[PDB]
Design a binder for these strands. Structure first.
Lengths: 130, 73, 140, 336, 125, 124, 304
RNA sequence: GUACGUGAAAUUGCUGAAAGCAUUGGAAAUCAGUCUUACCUGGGUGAGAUCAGUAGUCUCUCGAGACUAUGCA
RNA sequence: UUUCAAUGGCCCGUCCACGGACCAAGGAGUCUAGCAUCUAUGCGAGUGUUUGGGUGAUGAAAACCCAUCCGCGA
RNA sequence: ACCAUCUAGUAGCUGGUUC
RNA sequence: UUGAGAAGCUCAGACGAGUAGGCAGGCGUGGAGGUUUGUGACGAAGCCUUGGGCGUGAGCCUGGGUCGAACAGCCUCUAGUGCAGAUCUUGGUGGAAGUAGC
RNA sequence: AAACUUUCAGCAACGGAUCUCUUGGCUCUCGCAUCGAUGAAGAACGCAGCGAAAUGCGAUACGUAAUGUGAAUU
């Protein structure tokens, strides 16, 4: 099961990767950075980090900013998968917001990580008829 | 259903007889007493009679609007 | 002893002289539905017995009578059925629901039906809910 | 198996279903159905007597009809009417045939008898609320009536039995006298008087004068009687918790069946004093059960017709769209 | 109660002997009752199953089914019956096996050896 | 008599909070330098016999009755003469078939059941 | 079959890797020959439709065709619910009641049900009155449908409704009962009459239930309030939702117009356990439909 | 769902809320259980049974239980 | 339950030092022969069948029975 | 030098010894 | 007056630190015999739980969640029976640390 | 305020405890007596099934003959 359900099924898409050969600590900081963004902005941010434009800040494992290429490569593909899952699910692509991106450790085989991403549509409030 | 079904620990005969209540000296009938508790707190009320435990008191209804009521001494 | 059988109370007596015959060990008498007569029957059948043994039989008759009384009064009253909970059916039902809710697509179903309702114009000529700008695309 | 059935909308469907028909299976062929009759809910079918080949059909407004089924589709051979004054408060509760006489018992106790040929109509008054009334198959002129808070009584029109009595003198108001009256059983363990609400009556002397009948009550109790032995039931069985709907006989196995309002139809073995098997695969309360030979037709609130044999082997099954109210078996043998 | 110290009541030995039984022993372990009519006309209670025997499934999800035993899967102690199969996800009809004791033989495939077995086992063809 | 409890808190083991390997069941402190065994100030208490409750109201639930674990219908019929003194409790391993039969019987007997709403639903 | 755990895990790993390789090779060569020749691309896409439970639903003849049927409409024009669907247009009057001695949790949900229905009353169940006695009492008091919310152990688990005076009575078991507080991005309802939408009630038994739910709501919704109550039947699970809708632009939508939903609550699910013909008597009710649990194990077999 | 029965703790991530060992209470969150329907007394109406200025059957040891009739004072 | 407040509160075992990163599982007065006391049991100027023999048809390594000795006591 | 038994080699001693 | 589990019930008075050491009564685990007309696929055992209860305590009972095949009370028998530590044995996992470093 | 730090709860990991099982071990008893120059024990090499880090077999290579069951093997 996915850890969090921050939306409804008709208005969300998920993509995940298990036992990914990367580093758990670097992935956690990248995941913390892109959490809460929009799919269009996150794609721009990950490409910027790749082409030495912006650096991923380190908050818990600072020992500051850096440009982890392996971590962003995994998150770029996972978000592309989640975007594609939104196409097949008939979702709109303008309100797509990364609602819950989480990174968990994997069986030591190194420090592999499990990554899950859930992208939802921007919740809106309709005007009250009064 | 009348023959007891249980141990029926009958209470030992208590020796607490009921005697008339000795009220205060200053609670004579006809005196004006200030009500301290209840909906009519702070009202000044004329005492009519001294009941077994309370005082049957009432404010003249055309004066303060306190009907005939009991109040603890 | 006093014990119930088919809504009727009986007094069971055993004596030492029938100790080795389990079939004939206990004799039985039927106590009246009249409480006072039933108490009189226990005194009459148990006379010159120890007093605490007569005390205990009459206590059981009282407690059995009240048991019969509440048994009848619960029968008259309407009680809800106490229907058991089955773990496997409940688990299966929770699983199907979760999948049926996903497969229902409630938000899409509401929206597609609601829009096609607007296209058919089930509401007024210009429905109050839809604003002017959106309704322009309805005709177009 | 040729059968026909009536709905609550008053329509009559003649079904030419053959063995093995089962609508729930796509590969099975649907039964051949032709429909006729009124399409008004106010004229719904209630009872479906079988006067040998001829069939008598009741209606909610009392518009009794008579259809001969030798012709396909059956035509309205005869039509009879009942006075509207008898339907203001009462309701038709049974209809049985006995030696050229048609019975139209009302709920309040009115007993309407119409002769087939002479068209003579006689009214009989009885006791209070009626819920089940039956007519002796062998002995002419015997009526068994019962209803809520009304024990079973046997109104024997003739004092003796003989073998035959002329039809005109039967059913006279001044000649009927009750020769038996059921006595309520003793109170239960809780000393609660056992309530009486008769719902079905059957005469079981052929499978067991000398009246030997069995009744079923609203409290799920199947009571057998033997007037020689005594007024109280000879035996009583709590065969169900739900009110028992109706009771009958199975000629093939020489046994008895009953149904209750929770879609339970079972056959009762008086020989062993127990219920021996059940008619599986029935949903919804069975509206009416008809038996003829080695077949039994059950129709119910599942809007289906279930055809079993006397051995509770499901032979055929079909869907009939509208809500039924009665069934009747015409041809026991297969279509071919 | 067994009285013979030649036979074992050890569960470990009974379970080992059952599952490590050879294919000739498994031939007897897969035995099915005959129907009432065959039981009352061949005077034999039960026979080892065979290919091409007409059986009726008596217990399980496939209760009431009939068919001929296409094959006997002696390794898994399972029977395979005509048309008693299960549809896979792709549309294939993968057969489902049933225990030989959970069916009943309603028509025997009578070879000459069965008839000799019948007469030997107190039977009358 | 009212059901008076001298103490309501559990007698936690010393340093059961410091360590997950150390359980919270009481163990007397066997140490010879133990400050808490020495009953200093603020040190957590130790089970003494003085906390023992009144012999008249020992084993009594707050409603004055005593729990009597029951496994079937025959058990609740033993409490016929002690319904003001005992309360039936259905065991955790009794099924929902029997639980209904236990509860219905005990209702006529005038016996309180501490867990009569378990494993069941209401239909009314 | 390999009773050595490690070897059978290595044997599966080799089997899995080869299975993945040759399925990829088959997929790759098919992709190359489909992009080269579209005449087989949509040719495959038109037959290789993924299967789903609804498409593989077991056949039942009780499913009514979309075309009108005279016989069904003959039976539906003079039945119990006819006074709601005829020219009389009798305004429904609901009575809401809980089981005996309910808690605040029952009322915190009964209030939400009261919000869902204008002109619907709520009499707290008191004393020794019974559902067959409230029905008679509410029948003479002008009510036309009585809902009884059954709770035990501080949870509302069931809901029986009876159509007054003798109309069919339905028994539901509620599940996943969520209040407006428990719903994220909720709203506050207004006094406007909601608009009911019902989906996927194909079977004839479905229409009996659908008419029963339709008869609860006023036949003229106040569209200006744009409140919609949804009753959806999926795999026999009936979902009850209430929403506020506002039309706006939607590029993904077919006509470019789509609505935004804001949930109002309450949110719950039902399962139809019993249908009785008449006033609900649990012991002596004439069973129209009983839900057999052992027959519902077929995930492809539905009665609603 | 083969990294496959159950799946504990240490441990890690995310979300939510709060804050920056014992005693006693506050606030917040939660929870336990909680009763009305019965007792007595009077009458009316019917019911029956352990009642009959009543007849039989079976099992035990005159009468003790179980019954089947018939009556309802 | 969490938290706050007022009050108290110096890390545990071991013999200053020595052990302690955490958690789970495993982990230490045991069996046997001899002796002595005490208690219970059976019998008692006796006492102890089980080396062995008889016997045991439901399990037969049991239970039951006992010839000739022999021990300890007198 | 290594390897396998003897070996549970030699204890006034060290550390530990469970509701 | 019913209050004999005479091993029961009942009256009274005094007393209460505790290492070594002595005495007594209890709680728990694996297996044995007997017993509970014992529990169990309408869910055994286990595990989780800011749910409740009992006992001074060792501990026991229970609601809910999870689970899926066996289990327990009582009377005796028996023992490879109870852990916080032995720089204990085995396995697992941390902070050090994304540090030293390549 | 927020991050950060801590605590609690929920979910997701991690780990493989517990519980249940068990074609295994361990222990006791009983019955019997049979390797090799007529080439043993062991070792190597082949054969076909295959998963072989297993097994069977020997150029007649999962064995051939004869016997038995009687119709597979997967």
């Amino acid at each position: 099961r996915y850890s969090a359900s921050p939306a409804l099924e008709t208005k969300c898409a998920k993509a995940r990767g298990a036992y990914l050969r990367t580093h758990f600590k670097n992935s956690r900081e990248v995941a913390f950075t892109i959490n809460g963004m929009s799919l269009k902005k996150a794609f721009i941010f990950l490409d910027n980090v790749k082409e030495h434009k912006q650096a991923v800040p380190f908050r818990r494992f600072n020992g500051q900013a850096r440009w982890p290429v392996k971590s962003v490569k995994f998150f770029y593909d996972l978000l592309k998968n989640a975007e594609a899952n939104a196409e097949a699910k008939g979702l709109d692509m303008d309100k797509l917001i990364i609602k819950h991106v989480q990174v968990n450790a994997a069986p030591k085989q190194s420090s592999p990580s499990h990554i899950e991403i859930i992208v939802a549509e921007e919740e809106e409030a309709v005007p009250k008829a009064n | 259903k009348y023959y007891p079904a249980y141990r029926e620990n009958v209470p030992k005969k208590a020796r607490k007889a009921v005697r008339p209540t000795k009220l205060r000296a200053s609670l004579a009938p006809g005196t004006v007493c200030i009500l301290l508790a209840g909906r009519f707190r702070g009202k000044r009320v004329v005492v009519l009679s001294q009941l077994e435990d309370t005082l049957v008191v009432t404010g003249p209804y055309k004066v303060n609007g306190v009907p005939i009521r009991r109040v603890n001494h | 002893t006093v014990r119930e059988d088919n809504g009727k109370l009986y007094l069971y007596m055993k004596t030492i002289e029938r100790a080795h015959f389990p079939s004939k060990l206990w004799q039985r008498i039927k106590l009246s539905k009249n409480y006072a007569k039933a108490l009189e029957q226990i005194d009459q059948q148990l006379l010159y017995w120890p007093g605490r043994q007569i005390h205990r039989c009459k206590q059981r008759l009282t407690r059995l009578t009240q048991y019969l009384l509440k048994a009848r009064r619960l029968a008259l009253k309407h009680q809800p059925a106490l229907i058991p909970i089955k773990p496997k059916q409940a688990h299966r039902e929770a699983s199907r629901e979760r999948k049926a809710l996903i497969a229902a697509k409630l938000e899409k179903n509401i929206e597609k039906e609601l829009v096609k309702r607007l296209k058919s114009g089930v509401y007024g000529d210009q429905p109050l809910n839809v604003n002017e700008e959106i309704w322009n695309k309805v005709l177009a | 198996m040729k059968l026909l059935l009536g709905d609550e909308i008053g329509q009559l469907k003649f079904i030419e279903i053959k063995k093995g028909t089962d609508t729930s299976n796509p590969e099975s062929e649907a039964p051949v159905i032709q429909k006729f009759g009124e399409l008004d809910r106010e004229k719904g079918v209630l009872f479906m007597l079988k006067h040998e080949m001829n069939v008598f059909v009741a209606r909610k407004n009392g518009t009794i009809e008579c259809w001969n089924v030798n012709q396909e589709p059956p035509i309205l051979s005869s039509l009879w009417q009942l006075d509207s004054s008898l339907l203001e408060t009462a309701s038709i509760v049974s209809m049985k045939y006995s030696n050229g006489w048609l019975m139209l018992a009302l709920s309040d106790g009115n007993l309407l008898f119409r002769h087939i040929e002479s068209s003579k109509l006689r009214k009989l008054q009885l006791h209070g609320p009626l819920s089940a009334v039956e007519l002796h198959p062998r002995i002419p002129g015997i009526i068994a009536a019962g209803g809520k808070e009304n024990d079973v009584c046997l109104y024997s029109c003739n004092p003796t039995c003989k073998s035959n009595i002329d039809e005109l003198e039967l059913w006279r108001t001044e000649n009927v006298v009750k020769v038996f009256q059921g006595k309520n059983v003793k109170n239960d363990s809780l000393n609660l008087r056992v309530r009486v609400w008769i719902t079905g009556i059957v005469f079981t002397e052929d499978i067991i004068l000398c009246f030997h009948f069995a009744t079923i009550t609203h409290y799920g109790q199947l009571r057998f009687y033997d007037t020689k032995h005594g007024r109280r039931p000879v035996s009583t069985f709590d065969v169900s918790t739900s009110p028992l709907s109706h009771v009958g006989l199975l000629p093939s196995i020489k046994l008895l069946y009953f149904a209750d309002k929770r879609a339970q139809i079972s056959i009762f073995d008086h020989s062993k004093k127990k219920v021996i098997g059940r008619f599986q695969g029935v949903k919804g309360a069975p509206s009416s059960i008809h038996c003829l030979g080695n077949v039994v037709a059950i129709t119910g609130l599942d809007r289906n017709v279930r055809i079993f044999d006397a051995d509770r082997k499901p032979l055929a099954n079909a869907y009939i769209k509208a809500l039924p109210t009665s069934i009747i078996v015409i041809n026991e043998r297969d279509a071919e | 109660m067994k009285f013979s110290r030649d036979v074992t009541s050890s569960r470990r030995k009974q379970r080992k002997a059952h599952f490590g039984a050879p294919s000739s022993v498994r031939r007897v372990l897969m035995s099915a009752p005959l129907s009432k009519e065959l039981r009352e006309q061949y005077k034999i209670r039960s026979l080892p199953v065979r290919r091409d025997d007409q059986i009726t499934v008596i217990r399980g999800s496939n209760k009431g089914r009939e068919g001929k035993i296409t094959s006997v899967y002696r390794k898994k102690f399972l029977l395979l019956i005509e048309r008693v199969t299960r549809e896979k996800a792709n549309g294939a009809s993968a057969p489902v096996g049933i225990d030989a004791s959970k069916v009943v033989i309603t028509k025997l495939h009578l070879d000459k050896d069965r008839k000799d077995l019948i007469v030997r086992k107190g039977g009358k063809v | 008599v009212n059901i008076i409890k001298k103490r309501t808190k559990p007698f936690k083991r010393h340093q059961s909070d410091r360590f997950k390997r150390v359980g919270e069941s009481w163990r007397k402190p066997r140490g010879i330098d133990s400050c808490v065994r020495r009953r200093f100030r603020g040190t957590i208490s130790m089970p003494k016999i003085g906390y023992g409750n009144n012999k008249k109201t020992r084993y009594c639930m707050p409603n004055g009755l005593k729990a009597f674990l029951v496994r079937n219908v025959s058990d609740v019929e033993l409490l016929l003469m002690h319904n003001k003194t005992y309360a039936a409790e259905i065991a955790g391993n009794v099924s929902a078939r029997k639980r209904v039969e236990i509860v219905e019987k005990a209702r006529a007997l005038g016996v309180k059941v501490t867990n009569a709403g378990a494993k069941v639903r209401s239909q009314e | 079959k390999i009773k050595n755990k490690i070897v059978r895990q290595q044997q599966y790993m080799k089997a899995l890797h080869q299975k993945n390789k040759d399925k990829l090779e088959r997929r790759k060569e098919r992709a190359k020959e489909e992009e080269k020749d579209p005449e087989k691309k949509r040719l495959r896409l038109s037959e290789n439709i993924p299967a789903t439970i609804e498409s593989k639903r077991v056949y039942d003849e009780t499913i009514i065709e979309d075309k009108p049927d005279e016989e069904l409409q003959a039976e539906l024009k003079d039945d119990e619910f006819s006074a709601y669907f005829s020219e009389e247009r009798k305004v429904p009057k609901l009575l809401v009641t809980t089981s005996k001695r309910a808690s605040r949790k029952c009322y915190d949900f009964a209030s939400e049900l009261l919000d869902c229905f204008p002109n619907a009353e709520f009499r707290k169940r008191t004393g020794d009155i019974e559902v067959h006695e409230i029905a008679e009492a509410a029948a003479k008091r002008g009510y036309t449908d009585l809902l009884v919310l059954n709770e035990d152990r501080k949870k509302t688990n069931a809901l029986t409704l009876v159509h007054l005076p003798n109309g069919p009575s339905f028994y539901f078991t509620l599940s996943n009962l969520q209040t407006a507080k428990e719903i994220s991005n909720h709203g506050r309802s207004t006094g406007h009459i909601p608009e009911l939408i019902i989906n996927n009630f194909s079977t004839r038994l479905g229409m009996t239930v659908a008419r029963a739910f339709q008869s609860l709501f006023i036949q003229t919704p106040q569209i200006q309030g744009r409140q919609v109550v949804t009753i959806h039947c999926q795999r026999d699970f009936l979902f009850f939702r209430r929403h506020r809708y506002a039309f706006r632009e939607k590029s993904n939508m077919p006509d470019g117009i789509g609505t935004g939903l804001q949930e109002l609550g309450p949110r719950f699910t039902m399962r139809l356990r019993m249908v009785q013909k008449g006033v609900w008597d649990r012991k002596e009710g004439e069973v129209f439909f009983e839900s057999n649990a052992g027959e519902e194990s077929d995930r492809r077999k539905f009665w609603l």
